Amino acid sequence: LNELDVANSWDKLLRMMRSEYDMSCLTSCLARELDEDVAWNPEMLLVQLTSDM
Amino acid sequence: MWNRAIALAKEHRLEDVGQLLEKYAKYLIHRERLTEAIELYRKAGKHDEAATLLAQLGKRAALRDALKAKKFYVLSALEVQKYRTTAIRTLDAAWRGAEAYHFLLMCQQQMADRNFKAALVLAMRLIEYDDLVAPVDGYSLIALTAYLVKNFGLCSKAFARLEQAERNDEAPRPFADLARHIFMTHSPVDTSVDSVPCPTCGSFNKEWAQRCIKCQQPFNTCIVSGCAIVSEDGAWQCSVCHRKALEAVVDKYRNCPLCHTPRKG
Amino acid sequence: TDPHLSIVRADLATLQWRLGHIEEARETIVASPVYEEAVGTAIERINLYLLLYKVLRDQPWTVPLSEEGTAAADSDDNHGDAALTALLTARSLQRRLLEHQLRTTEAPEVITEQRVVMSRICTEAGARCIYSTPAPPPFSVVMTDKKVEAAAALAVQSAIASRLTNAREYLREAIAFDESNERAQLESAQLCYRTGDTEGCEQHCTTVLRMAEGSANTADAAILLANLYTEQNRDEDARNMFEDLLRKTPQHYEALVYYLILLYHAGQLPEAKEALERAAAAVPIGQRADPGLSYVRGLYEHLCNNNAEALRHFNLARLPAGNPWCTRALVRMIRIYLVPTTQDLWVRGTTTGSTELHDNIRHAEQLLLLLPVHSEERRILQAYCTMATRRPEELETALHLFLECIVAAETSTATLAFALQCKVIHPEAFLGLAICLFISGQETAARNVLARLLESKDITTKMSAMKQAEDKVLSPPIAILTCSEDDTIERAMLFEAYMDTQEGRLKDARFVLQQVLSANEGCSSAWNELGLIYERNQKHKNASQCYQKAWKLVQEADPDVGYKLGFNYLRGGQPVKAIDVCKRVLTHHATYPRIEADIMDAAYSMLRP
Ligand SMILES: [Zn+2]
Ligand SMILES: [Zn+2]
């Protein structure tokens, strides 16, 4: 368990872009998850993403 | 015994197998067994309506969390590519649908990559893709990255379209507030946008331009940076997903941003 | 070029106002030729006054005065409200054109369409009346004397009373012109509630909560009912209506919030799952939890003191940013980071936990950055983060922030004292002031500032009164009888009881604790402190039932009430209901010290004759 500090993905960033105005109403489309560094196989992942429910 | 039923109908020339396969597909849809349905489709060699039925749940996944939707489109493109080997308008429309959700991921994570210059180049490529992704989604990012690099002009067009959408919706909106606040607290003039010349006629065009403004020749766009390629020497062509990128950025990535094809050695 | 046309002047004044050009837009409006010949040539006339009112809707007016040093009684108060004059004129014009067209018998579709606009006009009139804006008092007359300006100020309350009586006039035509107008009935409910005619309040709110569907404004009436009924505990039917409300729509989270809070107050919290999960089941499966729904669940778990799970649920609720809960969820996240345990900020820290507290402040500041500067509570949460730091030099910074809060609200010791006696508008910041004073070692001025905050909410009147009332209704104080998210007065009286315990005059402390307990059963901390009070007088009998309630509220999560309730029973004389408590402690916390030798052995000794 070393991934409860996810808010850091906007902490040192928004410090330079939110301090002026209320532009948060515009950043709804930003995804919570980031992009990682690995090659995704076409078929190995669909089972694990459909097995959640 | 659907597996037995299809074999029984095939060996007795019961050409009505289409209705049986439709019933099986509907039953697996009701039991939400997409894995069983796609395995049945790939063992049966069905490509196009199979990809369509995959995309039916693809957009339902996309409307809330689409990092799986892009994967759905990727393997749909893989299925229509395997159709060529299975053989021995829709040829490029499937690839258009697959590439429709290419740009958004790196456009959003470009802020994390901190190189905000390429973020606008990525963001101004989804204008033609307003059918697959609603323009209210993309224009927010377009205006956001226009502000973050302190440039304007395109942000004015994005805010205008967004506010027209809002006025269509209400018939209390904060994007009008944002547009007015930015336009009065900053100079709303477009910066330099023509920085690449056409390789054919020498005409300077937009970095996000899909065609020349003078000779009307389409350019292949970079798959990660989004800039239109002018010289084939610095153009890297992928042999699997049939896409092109720039050498200076694709040298950093050991795998393709679309297919992640391993390099043969 | 063409000054006859006013269609262009409309958007001209609109654009001028929207860009903050106020006086310029006003002069644009008053310059219109129509402003003091087809059918339509009537209506746009009134339209300009509408726009006028809009650009003057937010403008703070004053009560007109006379230059001799008195209020000009011959000058009407609403004259100062130029927007109220505007739409007074507008509603008179609208009824005059109604009487104009009452004998025209044109195409009836336009008649039907027109028949409803005056309802909107007069409802906005009533809203402006009840939501009047008397300006802050001047300072030139303050720089004159200390009696003349007081005698002059004795007409502003007359002005507001006059305006609200006008609103009570406006109500009848407001409802009468359109009964299909949900907002009209809602406003009528609110003004009736302000007056006191509880019967009419019930009529209006019930009517709204029937016929209003597809709109969230019902919730604004719903809370009203939940305060209407529980003002005097005579009605508890709201509960039923709530589920009936929740029967029609499950996705009305904003009602579910008041549902949860009222249930928390009644102590019947865990049954809320009945309404909850079906709403959870209401959203189609395979979809992400709604951010409002996530906020709801996290709020529930916070009321269940499952703060660790509530943190996750609230962080799930923030996504995507810009949602109406986003500010709310962020505020709750900062609050629970500030107060994770039942110990709130005004407790006294008696090594190891200090570093974790610092890490909490890191998380809190990192999340607080996301809140806009334009948001009012951002600076208050900044001051609260500086409180969480608990650096005795940062107390000066904290009070500086908290006393710029008052200057925001209005729009040496002398500066803070002039911030003191101003009008109580922002109770959150006032509680921040009180914490500032207390953690600075100051208790007299802390008592004074909390006393002013309390005086704003009229729970002052019972402390001296109840002594002679019991010597010879125990009304639930109307401030607390909200069931909305505003927890500030609750924490205020909890703070006051804390202070009184610190000075040890436990009578009025237990008194106000009993007051909030009568208001609210879910306030587990107050249960704990009331039990502690009973221990101080060794009255373990009431403390036992209070601690049992507290144990239920904590959901067995603590060992401290273990030893507390066990000792309470043991000195109470009947620890047969403490043996199971001790084993209940040992079931999860198998190694809570001082258990195996102190209590059940003494209980066995007490069982012997
Ligand atoms: Zn060209
Ligand atoms: Zn590729």
Amino acid at B201: C
Nearest Cβ partner for C322 among A10, A18, A24? A24
C287–B64 CB contact, under 8 Å: yes
CA distance C432 to C77: 36
Residue C290, sorted as left (phi over 0), alpha (psi -120 to 50) or beta, turns out to be beta
B241 marked as part of a ligand binding site: yes
Phi, psi for residue B215 in degrees, rounded to 5: -95, -10
Nearest Cβ partner for A53 among C286, C315, C373? C286
Residue B40's CB is within 10 A of a number of other CB atoms, namely: 19
Cβ-based contacts of C287 with chain B (< 8 Å): 64
Paired tokens of C334: 């900062």
Cα B105 to middle of ligand 2, angstroms: 16
Across-strand partners of B152?
B190
Paired tokens of B1: 């015994």
Paired tokens of B218: 């389409």
Cβ-based contacts of A8 with chain C (< 8 Å): 366
Paired tokens of B116: 């905000």
CA distance C203 to C188: 10
Asked whether C148 and C69 are in contact (CB, 8 A), the reply is yes
Those residues whose C-beta lies under 8 Å from the C-beta of residue C137, and which sit 6 or more positions away, are C149, C153
Report angle CA B214, B219, B224 to the nearest 5 degrees: 135
CA distance B223 to B250: 9
Please report, for residues C42, C121, C169, the alpha-carbon distance to residue C115 in angstroms, rounded to integers and kept in the order given.
Answer: 15, 12, 20
B60–C18 CB contact, under 8 Å: no
Nearest-by-CA chain C residue for A7: C367
Nearest-by-CA chain A residue for C285: A53
Asked whether C599 and C567 are in contact (CB, 8 A), the reply is yes
Phi, psi for residue C329 in degrees, rounded to 5: -65, -40
From the list C332, C265, C149, the residue with the least C-alpha distance to C517 is: C265
Q: Taken in order C256, C261, C265, C268, is the CA torsion positive or negative? A: positive
SS3 assignment for C153-197 = HHHHHHHHHHHHHHHHHHHHHHHHHCCCCHHHHHHHHHHHHHHCC
Paired tokens of C254: 């904003």
Residue B122's CB is within 10 A of a number of other CB atoms, namely: 27
Which residue shows structure tokens 């008592």?
C447
Residue A36's CB is within 10 A of a number of other CB atoms, namely: 7
DSSP secondary structure of C426-446? -HHHHHHHHHHHHHTT--HHH
Amino acid at C309: E
Asked whether B230 and B220 are in contact (CB, 8 A), the reply is no
C286–B184 CB contact, under 8 Å: no
Q: Looking at the complex, does the CB of residue B30 fall below 8 Å from at least one CB of chain C?
A: no
CA distance B50 to B36: 12
Please report, for residues B102, B249, C77, C84, the alpha-carbon distance to residue C72 in angstroms, rounded to integers and kept in the order given.
Answer: 71, 77, 9, 18
From the list C88, C124, C110, the residue with the least C-alpha distance to C43 is: C110
Exposure string of C109-128, with b = 16+ CB inside 10 Å and e = fewer, is eeeeeeeebbbbbbbbbbbb
Looking at C283-323, list the stretches that DSSP marks H as alpha helix, in order from N- to C-terminal side: 291-303, 307-318
From the list C520, C553, C472, the residue with the least C-alpha distance to C233 is: C520
Residue C41 burial class via C-beta count within 10 angstroms: exposed 0-12, middle 13-18, buried 19 and up? exposed
Closest ligand to the CA of B224: 2
Residue A27 in 3-state DSSP?
helix
Q: Which secondary structure element, helix H or strand E, spans residue B66, and what is its range?
A: none
From the list A29, C87, C430, the residue with the least C-alpha distance to B133 is: A29
Residue B158 burial class via C-beta count within 10 angstroms: exposed 0-12, middle 13-18, buried 19 and up? buried
From the list A17, C333, C361, the residue with the least C-alpha distance to B112 is: A17
Chain B (33-62) residues lying within 8 Å, Cβ to Cβ, of chain C: 60
From the list C590, C582, C540, the residue with the least C-alpha distance to C561 is: C582
SS3 assignment for C483-550 = CCCCCHHHHHHHHHHHHHHHHCCHHHHHHHHHHHHHHCCCCHHHHHHHHHHHHHCCCHHHHHHHHHHH
CA distance C89 to C125: 11
Residues shown for chain B: 265
Q: Which structural technique was applied?
A: cryo-EM
CA distance C167 to C113: 25
Cβ-based contacts of C19 with chain B (< 8 Å): 180, 184
Q: CB-hemisphere CA count at 13 Å for B45? A: 6
Which residue shows structure tokens 């900044």?
C382
Report angle CA C529, C239, C250 to the nearest 5 degrees: 110
Residue ranges with strand state E in C348-453: none
CA distance C138 to C125: 27
Exposure string of C198-230, with b = 16+ CB inside 10 Å and e = fewer, is bebbbebbebbbeebeeeeebbbbbbbbbbbbb
Phi, psi for residue C134 in degrees, rounded to 5: -70, 125
B112–A35 CB contact, under 8 Å: yes
Asked whether C104 and C126 are in contact (CB, 8 A), the reply is no
Residue C592 burial class via C-beta count within 10 angstroms: exposed 0-12, middle 13-18, buried 19 and up? middle
Amino acid at C143: M
What is residue C591's DSSP assignment?
Answer: T
Cβ-based contacts of C288 with chain B (< 8 Å): 64-65
Nearest-by-CA chain B residue for A43: B75
A neighbour chains, 3+ CB pairs within 8 Å: B, C
Please report, for residues B221, C380, C396, C436, the alpha-carbon distance to residue C393 in angstroms, rounded to integers and kept in the order given.
Answer: 58, 18, 6, 11
Paired tokens of B130: 């307003």
Closest ligand to the CA of B197: 1
Asked whether C569 and C541 are in contact (CB, 8 A), the reply is no
Paired tokens of B192: 């330099």
Resolution in A: 3.5
Terminal alpha carbon distance of chain A: 23
Asked whether B44 and B55 are in contact (CB, 8 A), the reply is no
CA distance B58 to B97: 11
Asked whether C449 and C430 are in contact (CB, 8 A), the reply is yes
Across-strand partners of B204?
B197
Residue B125's CB is within 10 A of a number of other CB atoms, namely: 23
From the list C113, C4, C85, C98, the residue with the least C-alpha distance to C42 is: C98
CA distance C428 to C408: 13
What is residue B200's DSSP assignment?
Answer: T
From the list C315, C268, C309, C265, the residue with the least C-alpha distance to C289 is: C315
Which residue shows structure tokens 């020349």?
B212
Asked whether C258 and C223 are in contact (CB, 8 A), the reply is yes
From the list B225, B260, B263, the residue with the least C-alpha distance to B246 is: B225
Which residue shows structure tokens 């000792």?
C567
What is residue B152's DSSP assignment?
Answer: B
Paired tokens of C352: 């190891």
CA distance C350 to C77: 57
Is the omega angle on the peptide bond into residue C33 within 30 degrees of 0, that is, cis?
A: no
Asked whether B247 and B254 are in contact (CB, 8 A), the reply is no
Q: Taken in order B206, B207, B208, B211, is the CA torsion positive or negative? A: positive
Those residues whose C-beta lies under 8 Å from the C-beta of residue C263, and which sit 6 or more positions away, are C269, C271, C272
B222 marked as part of a ligand binding site: no
Dihedral angle computed from the Cα positions of residues B106, B107, B109 and B115, in that order, rounded to the nearest 10 degrees: 100
Asked whether C483 and C265 are in contact (CB, 8 A), the reply is yes
Q: Taken in order C380, C385, C386, C391, is the CA torsion positive or negative? A: positive
Q: Looking at the complex, does the CB of residue B232 fall below 8 Å from at least one CB of chain C?
A: no
Residue C81, sorted as left (phi over 0), alpha (psi -120 to 50) or beta, turns out to be beta
Asked whether B207 and B214 are in contact (CB, 8 A), the reply is no
Cβ-based contacts of A23 with chain B (< 8 Å): 144, 147, 178
Paired tokens of B30: 């009701």
Cβ-based contacts of A33 with chain B (< 8 Å): 67
Paired tokens of C537: 């007088």
Phi, psi for residue B197 in degrees, rounded to 5: -90, 155
Paired tokens of C427: 């109770």
CA distance B56 to B45: 19
CA distance C204 to C216: 16
DSSP secondary structure of C128-156? HHHT--BPPP-STTTTT-SSHHHHHGGGH
Cα B74 to middle of ligand 2, angstroms: 11
Closest ligand to the CA of B202: 1
Paired tokens of B60: 């339902």
Chain B (170-189) residues lying within 8 Å, Cβ to Cβ, of chain C: 174, 180, 184
Q: Which secondary structure element, helix H or strand E, spans residue C478, and what is its range?
A: none
CA distance C341 to C605: 36
List of long-range contacts for C365-369, beta carbons under 8 Å, 24+ apart: C366/A7, C366/A8, C366/A11, C367/A7, C367/C330, C367/C333, C367/C334, C367/C337, C368/C334, C369/A11, C369/A14, C369/A15, C369/A18
- CA C148, distance to chain mean position in Å, is 36
CA distance B139 to B237: 30
Asked whether C168 and C193 are in contact (CB, 8 A), the reply is no
**The pairing of beta strand B244-246 with beta strand B194-197:** unpaired
DSSP secondary structure of C15-68? HHHHTT--HHHHHHHHT-SS----SHHHHHHHHHHHHHHHHTTSPPB-----TT
Which residue shows structure tokens 């739409």?
C87
Report angle CA C323, C326, C332 to the nearest 5 degrees: 155
**The pairing of beta strand B235-237 with beta strand B244-246:** antiparallel
Asked whether B177 and B155 are in contact (CB, 8 A), the reply is no
Amino acid at C552: K
Residue C68 burial class via C-beta count within 10 angstroms: exposed 0-12, middle 13-18, buried 19 and up? exposed
From the list B142, B152, B135, the residue with the least C-alpha distance to B226 is: B142
From the list C476, C551, C25, C407, the residue with the least C-alpha distance to C233 is: C476
C287–B184 CB contact, under 8 Å: no
Report angle CA C215, C216, C220 to the nearest 5 degrees: 130
Residue B72's CB is within 10 A of a number of other CB atoms, namely: 23
Q: Which secondary structure element, helix H or strand E, spans residue C339, and what is its range?
A: none
Residues shown for chain A: 53
Q: Which secondary structure element, helix H or strand E, spans residue B245, and what is its range?
A: strand B244-246
